[PDB]
Structure formats: structure tokens, C-alpha cells
Amino acid sequence: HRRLGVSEELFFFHSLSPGSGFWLPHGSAIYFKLLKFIREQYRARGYTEVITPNIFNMELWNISGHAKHYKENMFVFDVEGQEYALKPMNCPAASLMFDFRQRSYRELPIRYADCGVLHRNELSGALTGLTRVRRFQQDDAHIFCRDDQIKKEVLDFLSFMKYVYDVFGIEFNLELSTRPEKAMGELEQWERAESQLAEALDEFVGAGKWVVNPGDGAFYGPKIDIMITDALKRQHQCATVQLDFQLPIRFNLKYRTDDADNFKRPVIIHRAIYGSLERFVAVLVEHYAGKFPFWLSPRQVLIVTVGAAFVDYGYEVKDAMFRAGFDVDIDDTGKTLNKKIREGQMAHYNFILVVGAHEKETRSVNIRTRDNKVTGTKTLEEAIAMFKELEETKAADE
Amino acid sequence: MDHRRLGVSEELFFFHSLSPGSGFWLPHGSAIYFKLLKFIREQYRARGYTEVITPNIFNMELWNISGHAKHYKENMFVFDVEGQEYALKPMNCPAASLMFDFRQRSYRELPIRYADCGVLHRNELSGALTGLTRVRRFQQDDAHIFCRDDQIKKEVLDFLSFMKYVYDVFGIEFNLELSTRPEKAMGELEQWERAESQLAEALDEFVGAGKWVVNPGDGAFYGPKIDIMITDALKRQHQCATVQLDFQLPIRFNLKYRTDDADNFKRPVIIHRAIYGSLERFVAVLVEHYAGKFPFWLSPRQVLIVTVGAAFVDYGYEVKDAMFRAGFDVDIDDTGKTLNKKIREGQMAHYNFILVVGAHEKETRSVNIRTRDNKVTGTKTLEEAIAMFKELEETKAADE
Amino acid sequence: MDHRRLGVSEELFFFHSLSPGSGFWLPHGSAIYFKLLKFIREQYRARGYTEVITPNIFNMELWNISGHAKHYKENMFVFDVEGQEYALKPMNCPAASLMFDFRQRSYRELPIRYADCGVLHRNELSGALTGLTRVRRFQQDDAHIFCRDDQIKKEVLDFLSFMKYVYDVFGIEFNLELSTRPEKAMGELEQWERAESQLAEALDEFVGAGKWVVNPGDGAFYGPKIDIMITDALKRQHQCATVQLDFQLPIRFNLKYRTDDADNFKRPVIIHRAIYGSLERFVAVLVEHYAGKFPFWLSPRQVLIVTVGAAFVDYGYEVKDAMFRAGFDVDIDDTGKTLNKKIREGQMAHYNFILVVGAHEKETRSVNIRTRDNKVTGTKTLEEAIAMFKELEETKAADE
Ligand SMILES: C[C@@H]1C[C@H](C)C[C@H](C)[C@@H](O)CC(=O)O[C@H]([C@@H]2CCC[C@H]2C(=O)O)C/C=C/C=C(\C#N)[C@H](O)[C@@H](C)C1
Ligand SMILES: C[C@@H]1C[C@H](C)C[C@H](C)[C@@H](O)CC(=O)O[C@H]([C@@H]2CCC[C@H]2C(=O)O)C/C=C/C=C(\C#N)[C@H](O)[C@@H](C)C1
Ligand SMILES: C[C@@H]1C[C@H](C)C[C@H](C)[C@@H](O)CC(=O)O[C@H]([C@@H]2CCC[C@H]2C(=O)O)C/C=C/C=C(\C#N)[C@H](O)[C@@H](C)C1
Ligand SMILES: [Zn+2]
Ligand SMILES: [Zn+2]
Ligand SMILES: [Zn+2]
């Protein structure tokens, strides 16, 4: 069906910035709602969102390993004779934030969310739509925990992830990817960590129903491989849980351990659910075929006027809908009523509200669904109450 | 060179969830794809290439011999036939070798240029499939060039010339670089130096000495490469063309030629080469490059006839029939809409030419031509108008 | 009457143990295959067909819908993609449906004729796979036609006419049978009747009441068909052509068209049709049929130039080049061999013409012509000769 084609005013691309989206108002509306949902959860689940820089001195990248492993994918420039790069990952700035002041063990775990803009270089010809972009924002958060806290942190992540996915009807599958041949930890770290990942997995999924990919871990840590399935039965990688034993060392991260004096290093968990906002929108656009659910739709309500006489009343309905918080439009024109309705359905509006003489006199709306079902005439108060519930509950169509 | 892009995709092809990553080409798209094939084939004939036809599925032992098993298995669709491992072909490059090995060949015979347009398959994750840029299924304009060591410069020079010729038709620009023996490599040094020397020489020639860049150590482990990047009207860069030499594949398949006399056999050098890169990919480039407005020869919507009135329809259909016989891709609007709408609706559809027919025109037995960008070419007779269209096609003319 | 006559007949094509059941078409072979495709493609354009391109692998859910999963699975190659079942297509007939369903279609459009020349695989047991007659891999000249039920007789009549026309070119003969509704059939009765009546009517018009036969109850469960049998010069009978209606095919895929400019929809009829049957198979037929002596238009060895002396070789290449530029497949023997030998050798290799060039010919810009079947034509100017060859090609002339 086409992420890009479905640009009935969601997003576009221009040759002056290939790989970077232009999000039109209706497009933005979706992006923002997704952010608002993720943020509502972050607050509920113990995360604090932080803001970080976008350009850094190459020295940061040297420390991280990005200079070694990633440089080809980065936008590199000169500042005052010094090499600088646009950030491809938030994952190092987050470490600096954690090192800002000394941390005690009781504090674990610290969870920082970052919605910052990332850049990765890709060849211009290679770029298409939102699937392969230069510019994106991850729903990134990087979690710092004690070694004993891994199972709970992972378990908690899985619920968060599941909770989100459930909202959209999206399926997932989990595997454990274990230590590779070239790997940088001590054995002790890997065993404790993998054991916990297993434990979390056998609690979340239960003993039997998860495969292991032995030796498929990152050099820097063990991971749980997540794959998601859309309604067309395509698979995407959106979610991650990746442990990192390297980054804590490189940035010299520590927490004071009760009796200390001494200190220990935290484990870092790089994690995401959307993967990026850009990527997730692309998935959803196709997954719903451009028929979004009422909460996330940028075209929630359309008012259609029966005749010129009821047009002012329509503007009244629209005002009320807008104040109540809805994305609402009004047809307004001399077009035939049947036409107006059909067009609105074509536009994908979740609800069409026809207002005639009856509605005006009784302060009500006559409601038609996207699917052309005939919900009842309802009063304005009743309609608003209905929409709120749909919104609040994040109800699906199906 | 400044516009909003229109990637995947305007509608000449589509994709279905039942085969994600594999195109369905609608009649207008197919027409383009077949037109490209025809052009390359016309060139192949003129330039010493013979197109061959090969199998699509092979036993894994082939891939074992090739190196695909070690390096590529991950991207292959692999399956069982009667207990034996099999795979759909990622590349033609191995079957071509077997063709070379069919019968004994002599040095006089070089260079044997075999072209293959066969369907290839590579595995890619479904989520990550979008458009024609990343597909499971594609057809390369692939062509292997089996040659003597002494023959590389000419064959490469000949290739570069073919490539430029094709690209110029489309207004496409290119940049050439040389990539040289890497640290981990498989051949003998001599074959590498002789080859790289011939390559530089080819570059000095065409591009000019000191005007081209070297990427030292950026070649493949099985041979030197000329790295090519092409640039479209939007200033985007693509990898479509390739020249890659291969010393491994000839060993693996035990390829030989008889040298003058019977002293010895020598192994040929292989050059894996391409210009379109793949038909699916080239189209995707062209669609953007032209912004949906193809040049007359290549357009699936060359001529649209529009009728002023009903007394006129018969004349148009007659006109339309003449255009069709003449070989043109022609459509008609016999509907009753007001003219300006007809013209505008057609222009929107990117018809190269709109042919307007009125009472005078019938009687005139002639035609009134409006160009795509709205220019009033003014009326003409049939036989001439055709002659004029025929000429744009024969010459492969670009628009204004 | 004489030994026969395929597989061994060279050069043309070969099989390898790495892909049994899949042909390797050597250049002389490909040349034949391409010509056949090109002939069929010319006819398609002339006859309202549009060729399209389709995917080669599909999720199993497509085959479940079509009936392939029930009926055909053991004849298919099946593999896993991302944990889901997939198969290589044994038929194009289902992809064509998806194409039809891409956009709403109207009574105005009918009939819709989509040609597909795509690659198909069927999983035959390896021991059974001999030659081109029984292969894993093939390209059909498939077209699956979409029409209103009232359009059947006219469409079938048009097909028969197209088919006779192709066969006539080769001197090939046909016989027609009608297979009617089986005991276990799936239609509504009416549709079968209406259809069967139309078919009989086309048959009556095409060949007359006398000349066709009926096989009652030999129809497919999903449709009535016309059996076509063709006869070669050796009096061997082949089935290549078919016309098979399908009533199931459209229900399964929920196909419809708008009948009016109101609110009403009907299902189309599908006709799965072929003439060559497969390109691999039609070649096998033609090789035997001609005994390797192909008519000039289709020959991969049209002209051989033979030189009388060393002093004449350069004029000879001059001749060869002109011949090639003219579009002919042409070779030269510049060997030291006796002229009488060269000629006999060319004739054995089956070249249609031998062009003898000597001093008078070089002096005159002439050739001295001998046919395949010996037979001495005499002298022509290089121009006359090319014009003569052009006529034979253009008309697709038989030797007799
Ligand atoms: C500099 C190294 C690059 C690495 C080898 C690149 C690989 C292709 C791959 O490992 C990247 C990866 O899986 O990152 C994944 C991220 C999480 C979201 C998806 C992926 C994302 O952002 O794309 C996690 C790692 C972040 C890592 C670090 C930092 N700093 C590492 O400590 C450091 C060793 C990375
Ligand atoms: C099995 C090996 C896989 C190779 C190492 C994959 C690399 C990513 C890369 O080297 C592929 C490549 O450059 O192929 C390029 C092809 C040519 C057209 C574009 C590219 C194409 O078709 O994509 C050509 C190489 C074909 C090579 C072989 C064969 N047989 C080699 O002898 C064999 C050793 C290759
Ligand atoms: C799944 C079913 C298999 C069928 C019962 C197998 C039989 C052996 C025979 O019926 C096949 C046949 O006659 O096909 C003939 C084809 C046409 C060219 C030659 C023959 C060819 O390609 O071999 C036509 C039917 C294609 C049909 C379908 C599709 N999709 C049907 O709607 C579907 C019900 C077919
Ligand atoms: Zn990270
Ligand atoms: Zn190759
Ligand atoms: Zn069929």
C-alpha cells in the first residue's frame, strides 16, 4: 500500500534533504501522539526524560567505539580544527549524564529516556520513505542497574513493550542471543546476566516457548532478540533489549556500594519500543492501511452540513469538538450530503457527524462511522463523552 | 533540480503482502521494463554480446564451489529437493561459468561475452522491503566477459563506452574510481598488477590521466574493481553500473582456454559487469529522475487523442488506429467532457502528446497537437505527425 | 520417415547434473527461444494483449486460496521464509487475478487480456526428467483472459484464429476437441451451459460441425475446455495449445467488474490460454519437426560465408559485417580448406545459405549463393542478397 504514497498529507520528502522527513500537520499529529503516549508511560514506569546535545567532539566517539565501528555511518565535520560528529546514538551522552554526580547503590536503577535527533549517513539513492532515513528520533532510553537487578528490569520492560504493542494489535517474538566467540566481558558477567535474561523470559513467556540463538550476542553484551509482526504479516525490528558491559567501563561509570569506599560498575541496557518514531509510523500506516484508531487518528471527526441554514450550527459543533480536544473538520459546502459523507469516508475520518435541522434544534449530532455504520443520533454532550472514552481507552476498531 | 520527491511509488507497479519484495508490473510499467530490455538487447547485439538462458534453481554443491555457500547463504532461499539441498540463484555469475566450460575454447575465440537476464532472488526481511530499491526479486542486466589477461584494457574500454552511451540517452552522469588489491586477497600478484595496470590505462584514456581517483586496497578479494557511481537529476547517487574482475571463479570452475598451439591452457579472466544494475532498480531511478515524465520513446503514454465532438469520434479512432499501427502507445478520450478538462486530465497523466481533433482536422485529415508542457505545436497532417513521432523515437530524443 | 531426433541435436542446449530439469541455452539455442518470444510478442500487440510481469515466489496462503495447496503441492517447491510457508509458482494463473483486482474494473474494459511469460517450476522426480519434454523449469506463453460471459464465443474465436495463425507459420496442424462438464463440477449449471454453448458455436464457425469432436464429461471440475492437439511432420501428436475456462478461479479471488454505471457487479470469466504451451517444449517440437533444418527467419545459422582464397578474406568479412548489420546470424569460414569442403560443411551445419566469395565477387561487390540443400542460385549483388534475405525473414518463408 506504500508509506510514501499514503501522503494524503502526512509527510513528504524533498531533494534538498533526502532522508529527512517533512511532517505536515496531520503527520505531526500522529508523531506527537505517539510521543505523548510513550511519555505517559515513562512517567508511570520510572523513567525521567532528559535532553542532550546533538554534536560532539570526536573524542567522545573514540571513547565509545563509534570511531572504530561506525565512522562511515556518521556525519563528520570540523570545528575549530577539531573533528566533530552529529550523533548517531544517544547511548554515550547518557553515560555522561550518569557520571554527573556520584551514585549510591540504593539509587538503582536509574532510567533515562532520550528523544533526541539522530543522524546516520546513507547513500542518497538508497533512501526511501521512513524505512530508510538519515534523520530520526528513537524512543531511546538507556538503563543503569546493578547486576542483581537485571531480571526485574527486563521483566518490567517486557510488560511495557507488550502494553504498548497490544494497543496497536502488534505481535512479538523473543529469543535470547548469547555470548559470541569474540567478546569483551569477564565470564562471570555474562553468566549472571544471561541467567537472569533466561529467568525473565521463562516468567514472561514461560519455560518452554523461547528459542536461544547461542553465540549471537553482541560483543559487548547479551541481548534479547525481538521481532514484531504487523497485520500484513511482515516482520520488523523495532524493539530492543541489549545489555552493554563495555560502555560502563569506557566512561568509567560507578556506583558506591553500601560498604564503600569501594564501587562497582552498572550494567547498561539500551532499550526501545518504537525503534524510532519515523519507523513506527511507517509500520502503522501500512498496518492500518491508513485507517487509524480514534485515539491516534489525525482525522477524528468530520462535520457535514445538510444545508446552508445549519452551517453556523456546524461551526458550533466543531468548536465544541475542538475544545474537547479532538481533531475535527467541517465540510461546509454545497456538495451533496451523500457526497460529503462519502468523501469523508474516503478521507478516513473515524466519525462523520451530520447536522441537520433536527440536530440543531436538539443540540445533537447524527453519527456515521467510517465503515458506514449508523450509530445513533446523540446529544453533543453524549457524543463528546463517547469520544473521550474511545480516546481514553485507546480502543481499536477490531 | 529542485523538487519534492515521489519515491515508492507512482503506479506502474505494486506490491502485495503475499509476495512482499516482488513487483507486480502493471501494463504501463511493463511497457517500460520491456522497452529497457529491448534497448539493452539491441546494444548487446551490436557490441559482441550473446544473451543466454540459464537455470533458476541449483543444487547446493554449485554454491559450495562458487563461494556462495560460505559467504552468501544467509541471503539465499534454500530448500530441499529429494533430500538434497538446493537454492534459488542469487547470481548468474556461476551458471555462466558452466556455459564457458561446455566445450573447449581457444584463445582465438576470446572474449566470450555472455549476457544473462535471468530472475534472481535474495532474501531480505519483509518489514524492510520498500519499493524497487530493496526487493527480493529482480532481473539484472548482467553480462560476464571471459577474456585473456592481455585483453582487459580493451574490453573495459569497450564497456565504459557502452555504459556512457546508454547513460547519455537518459541524461545520467557518472563517476569512476579504481579500487585495488586489498590486504586479504587470493590471487597471484602478477595477475593483479597486470590487471590493475590495464585498468588505470583504460581510465587514463577515457577520463584522462590524473583526472581519476584511486581507492587503494578497496578492491574485492577476488579481484580489482572499477567503482562506479551515477548521478540523477535530483543529484542523488546510485550504484547501478559495475566492472568487477574475478580471479577466483575461473579457478573454482576449472575454466581454461587453449593457448596458441597446445603448450598450455590458460585461465580466463572474468569480468562481472552491469549497466542498469537491475531492471527494477533502473526504473526506480528513472521514475524519480524524470519525475514521472518519460521521454517520448520510453513513455507508456505517448499519445492521447481527444475529441471535440461526436461527429468526430470516428475520425479519432481512425486516428488512434493509425498511431497504433505505427507502433505508438496511444489512448483516446471519446468522453463528452469539456475540452480543457480533457487536455488537462491528459497532461496530468503525463502524455507526451495530446492530439486534438475537430471538424477541421477531419476534413483537413490532420491533427492539432498540444505538448505535455502545454505548448501549442499546432495542427498537422497525419502522415507528417507520424513521421515526427517516429523521429523522436528513432533518435531517443529527450524533452526540451 | 527417419531416426529422431532431439536432445542430441546440437548445439542449442544442454543439461547439467547440478540443475536437472533446467535448461542451459547456448547461444544458438537462445537465439531460437528469443525469436519465438518476439514473434508471440508481436502478435500480442496486434491482438489486444498486454504483457505483464509477476512475482516468482509466494506465501502459501495464495496457493491455499487457489487450490494449489490441495491439488498441487507435491508438484511444487516449498520452503520457509521467516517461518512461513512459501512456494515457487507452478502457475501464473493466480497472480493474474491479483492484478485484475488491483483496481475496480468496468464493463467498458472487458475483455482484459494479460500475458505472462514468467518462469515456472514444477517438482518432477529427477529420474524422470529427460530433455525438454519433461522439465522442472519453463516459461509458458501464458495469458489468462478476463471477460464477460457474453464475450466467450468471440474471445475463443479470436484465440483460435491467433493460434491457427501461429501454427500455420510452422506448417503445423491441429485438431480440436471439446471437453464438457464432469460429474463432479463446481459451477452453477447455468454458467456451464451458457459457456459450452458458446464454445460449440465457435467451434462450428471455426472448423465446422464436421471437424471437431466432443468428449463428454472430460472437462475440468472448474471449467469446460477445448482440447487442442497438434501434429508434426513426423505425424506425432503434441498438446501445446489449450483453452480452459475457469469458474472457480474467479470466486476464490473475489473478482468482479462493474456492469453498469450503477451499483451492480458480476464476476468475470477466466480463460487460461496457451499456444506454444511452453517455450522449452515448443522448441523441442520444432527441432524434430524440422530435423534441425530451421526456416530462414528462425534459423540461428542463416548465412555462412566461404572464402576461396586468402586474397579474398577481407572482402568476406566485409560481407559478413554487412550481413550482420542487416540483422542476420552469420558466420565465415576463412580456413585453408577446399572450397568444396567448406560448402559441404556449412550444409551439414545446416546454414540456410552459403555465400561463396571469390575474385569476381570482390570485384563486383557480389556474392555467389548456394542453399542448404545444395542448389545453385547464382550471383547476386550484396544488395540484392540482403534484400532477398530480408524478404524471406519478413514473410517467414518456409523452405517448402
Ligand atoms: C560503537 C559500537 C557500534 C556497534 C558495533 C554497531 C553495531 C552495528 C550494532 O551493535 C549496533 C547496535 O546493535 O546498537 C544497539 C542499538 C539500540 C537500538 C537499536 C540499535 C541502534 O541504535 O541502531 C545497541 C547498542 C548501543 C551501543 C553502544 C554504544 N555506545 C556500544 O557500547 C558500542 C560498542 C557500539
Ligand atoms: C560468493 C562471493 C560473495 C561475495 C564475497 C559477496 C560480496 C558482498 C560482494 O563481493 C558481492 C559482489 O560484489 O558481487 C558483484 C556483483 C556484480 C553485479 C553487482 C554485484 C551483485 O551481483 O550484487 C560481482 C561478483 C560476483 C562474484 C562471484 C561469484 N560467483 C565471486 O567469484 C564470489 C567469490 C562472490
Ligand atoms: C489448483 C488446480 C489444479 C488442477 C486441478 C491440476 C490439474 C492437473 C489440471 O486441472 C491443471 C490444468 O489443467 O491447468 C490448466 C493449465 C493451463 C495451461 C496448461 C495447464 C497447465 O499449466 O498445466 C489450466 C488451469 C489453471 C487453473 C487454476 C488455477 N489457479 C484453477 O482455477 C485451479 C482450480 C487449478
Ligand atoms: Zn544505546
Ligand atoms: Zn557474475
Ligand atoms: Zn491458468
Side-chain angles (χ1 to χ4, degrees), chain A residues 173-297:
Chain A
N173 182 252
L174 307 193
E175 320 191 308
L176 185 47
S177 274
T178 65
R179 192 206 211 243
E181 246 174 276
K182 292 187 266 269
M184 65 59 62
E186 302 282 287
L187 295 174
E188 293 177 350
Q189 276 179 289
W190 291 81
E191 300 179 322
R192 295 191 305 254
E194 313 203 309
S195 202
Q196 283 185 89
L197 300 180
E199 229 142 64
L201 295 174
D202 290 324
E203 171 162 333
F204 187 77
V205 149
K209 311 78 151 315
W210 60 261
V211 326
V212 190
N213 306 298
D216 284 356
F219 67 79
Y220 48 88
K223 64 179 180 180
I224 296 179
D225 224 290
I226 313 207
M227 198 84 13
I228 60 157
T229 315
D230 74 19
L232 302 189
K233 272 92 79 173
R234 292 124 50 148
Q235 296 201 309
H236 318 260
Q237 293 177 335
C238 282
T240 320
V241 191
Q242 173 73 250
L243 280 69
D244 203 331
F245 301 133
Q246 187 179 115
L247 199 63
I249 294 156
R250 293 272 177 117
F251 283 95
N252 198 28
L253 305 182
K254 292 182 292 297
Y255 59 95
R256 176 211 276 250
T257 61
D258 187 285
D259 243 301
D261 236 65
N262 328 317
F263 72 77
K264 268 187 185 98
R265 309 231 178 270
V267 173
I268 286 165
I269 304 188
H270 300 291
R271 39 64 77 224
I273 293 150
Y274 292 151
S276 71
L277 280 290
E278 284 84 3
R279 185 186 289 293
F280 210 69
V281 169
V283 169
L284 297 172
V285 153
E286 318 183 299
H287 171 87
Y288 290 121
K291 293 147 130 192
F292 299 84
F294 174 92
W295 79 270
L296 179 69
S297 179

Side-chain angles (χ1 to χ4, degrees), chain C residues 330-349:
Chain C
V330 59
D331 284 334
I332 187 170
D333 179 333
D334 49 2
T335 299
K337 272 198 219 67
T338 189
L339 180 60
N340 272 1
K341 183 178 179 180
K342 286 169 165 188
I343 309 196
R344 293 182 183 174
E345 263 173 34
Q347 289 163 346
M348 285 162 208

Side-chain angles (χ1 to χ4, degrees), chain C residues 93 142 144 272:
Chain C
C93 330
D142 211 7
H144 296 112
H272 317 241

Side-chain angles (χ1 to χ4, degrees), chain C residues 325-389:
Chain C
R325 286 196 319 268
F328 304 127
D329 289 326
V330 59
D331 284 334
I332 187 170
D333 179 333
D334 49 2
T335 299
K337 272 198 219 67
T338 189
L339 180 60
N340 272 1
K341 183 178 179 180
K342 286 169 165 188
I343 309 196
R344 293 182 183 174
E345 263 173 34
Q347 289 163 346
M348 285 162 208
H350 293 307
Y351 288 79
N352 297 74
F353 292 102
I354 312 273
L355 295 174
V356 162
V357 304
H360 167 68
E361 295 85 357
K362 179 175 175 75
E363 263 150 43
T364 59
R365 293 182 183 174
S366 284
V367 291
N368 182 51
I369 301 166
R370 294 183 181 277
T371 83
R372 177 154 57 198
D373 270 356
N374 226 352
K375 170 155 217 256
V376 194
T377 299
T379 285
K380 302 229 191 283
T381 68
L382 187 62
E383 312 108 79
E384 278 150 356
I386 289 177
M388 183 176 282
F389 293 169

Side-chain angles (χ1 to χ4, degrees), chain C residues 248-277:
Chain C
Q248 182 179 118
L249 193 335
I251 288 159
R252 285 283 163 118
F253 275 97
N254 207 13
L255 314 180
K256 26 197 83 180
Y257 70 100
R258 206 185 68 232
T259 42
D260 42 27
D261 289 345
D263 79 328
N264 289 337
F265 289 72
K266 291 174 65 175
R267 305 216 186 285
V269 190
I270 280 176
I271 298 160
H272 317 241
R273 35 72 73 242
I275 300 174
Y276 294 155

Side-chain angles (χ1 to χ4, degrees), chain C residues 118-129:
Chain C
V119 189
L120 311 160
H121 292 84
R122 277 162 207 197
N123 184 11
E124 319 277 344
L125 187 66
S126 55
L129 301 157

Side-chain angles (χ1 to χ4, degrees), chain C residues 269-290:
Chain C
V269 190
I270 280 176
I271 298 160
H272 317 241
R273 35 72 73 242
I275 300 174
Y276 294 155
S278 84
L279 266 66
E280 278 77 5
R281 182 200 279 309
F282 204 66
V283 166
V285 168
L286 299 184
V287 163
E288 277 145 7
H289 171 73
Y290 283 126

Side-chain angles (χ1 to χ4, degrees), chain B residues 93 142 144 272:
Chain B
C93 324
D142 181 65
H144 301 108
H272 300 291

